Amino acid sequence: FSALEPLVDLPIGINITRFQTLLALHRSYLTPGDSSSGWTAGAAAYYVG
Amino acid sequence: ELLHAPATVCGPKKSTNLVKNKCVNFNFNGLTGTGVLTESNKKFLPFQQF
């Protein structure tokens, strides 16, 4: 069991009906380092409810 | 200009001197009440306010 605590409150007035997540891509000299095959997604899992 | 967003500019609030151990009318952050203030041992969580 885990209890979640408030962090921040925003006063923005926008309306939201959709959203998306942003991921980090690793580029290095061990890979081609391009947008075709040099990217690596690493290890990560996120669950949506 | 006022919009659907909540108002965020107004006259600054004034903090009067605290009075202890006497039945006094009080207004803490918009919470109004009539009672006697005393020092309390119980500890709140940081985000909790009352």
Q: Tell me the three-class secondary structure of chain B, residue by residue.
A: CCCCCCCCCCCCCCCCCCCCCCEEEEEECCEEEEEECCCCCCCCCCCCCC
Which chain B residue is nearest to residue A14, measuring alpha carbons? B5
Give the closest residue to A39 by CA, choosing from A48, A31, A49. Answer: A31
Please tell me what DSSP assigns to residue A29. T
Nearest to B47 among A6, A12, A13 (CB): A6
Rama region for B29: left / alpha / beta (φ>0; ψ in -120 to 50; rest):
left
What resolution, expressed in A, was reported for this entry?
Answer: 3.3
Give the closest residue to B20 by CA, choosing from B38, B33, B35, B32. Answer: B38
Give the closest residue to B29 by CA, choosing from B44, B48, B42. Answer: B48
Q: Which residue has the tokens 């998306």?
A: A20
